[PDB]
């Protein structure tokens, strides 16, 4: 009967979100919805879906997400898993929904709400990247640049000192990956951060 139960849960979540004015009230109302113990992923998934379905990204949903992942740790882990899930399944969303999801996760990252652990699932190689993934990364990284300033961004990326190691963003020195990574990060507009691995091509 989980088909009907899931559908009822999604309808309740959507109505609760749509009957809300500010994110604080929406989080307060969403916590009141009793949900299965292992279905915390459903709430986050549908919050992201509702964010995507709208015409223009509104800070409402980003604020909701960061408040949940600031309330506890299970929500933070759930949102990291959501980013992982949405990355490989990004090719099936239109450009507008893709942009809305990218802004959602960029606002999550910019406030240190999920940690940049998630970038270890990103590999910038044509064997496992598409136009959709490149557009996703473009939008996310630009939005992070306005939010942080490209000054702090270079320390945040250059100095991981944790399990995020950017082994796909700054690809492990191998094959023609470095050329593509450098030229892509320039074409996006970042540029500044890739000069560190610019010299590797001279090394090899």
């Amino acid at each position: 009967q989980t088909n009907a139960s899931l559908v009822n849960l999604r309808k309740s979540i959507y109505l609760t979100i749509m009957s809300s004015v500010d994110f604080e009230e929406c989080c307060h109302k969403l916590l009141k919805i009793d949900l299965p113990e292992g279905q915390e992923i459903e709430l986050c998934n549908m919050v992201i879906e509702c964010n995507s379905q709208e015409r223009t990204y509104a800070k409402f949903y980003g604020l909701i997400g960061e408040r949940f992942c600031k309330l506890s740790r299970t929500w933070r882990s759930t949102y990291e898993q959501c980013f992982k899930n949405y990355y490989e399944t990004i090719h099936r969303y239109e450009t507008n929904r893709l942009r809305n999801i990218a802004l959602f996760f960029a606002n999550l990252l910019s406030t240190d709400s999920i940690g940049w652990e998630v970038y270890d699932c990103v590999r910038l190689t044509e064997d496992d990247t598409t136009a959709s993934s490149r557009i996703f990364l473009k939008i996310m990284f630009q939005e992070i640049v306005e939010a942080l300033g490209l000054k702090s961004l270079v320390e945040r990326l250059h100095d991981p000192n944790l399990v995020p190691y950017l082994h796909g963003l700054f690809p492990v020195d191998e094959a023609r990956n470095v050329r593509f990574s450098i030229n892509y990060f320039t074409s996006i507009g970042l540029g500044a951060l890739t000069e560190e691995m610019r010299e590797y091509l001279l090394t090899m």
């Binding site: 050329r179 450098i182 320039t186 507009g189 500044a192 890739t194 091509l201």
Partner: peptide
Amino acid sequence: IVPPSVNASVNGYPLVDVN
């Protein structure tokens, strides 16, 4: 102010070829 892109450096940093 210099344009962000040129004929191929963007934001100053050149576009890297293979050669």
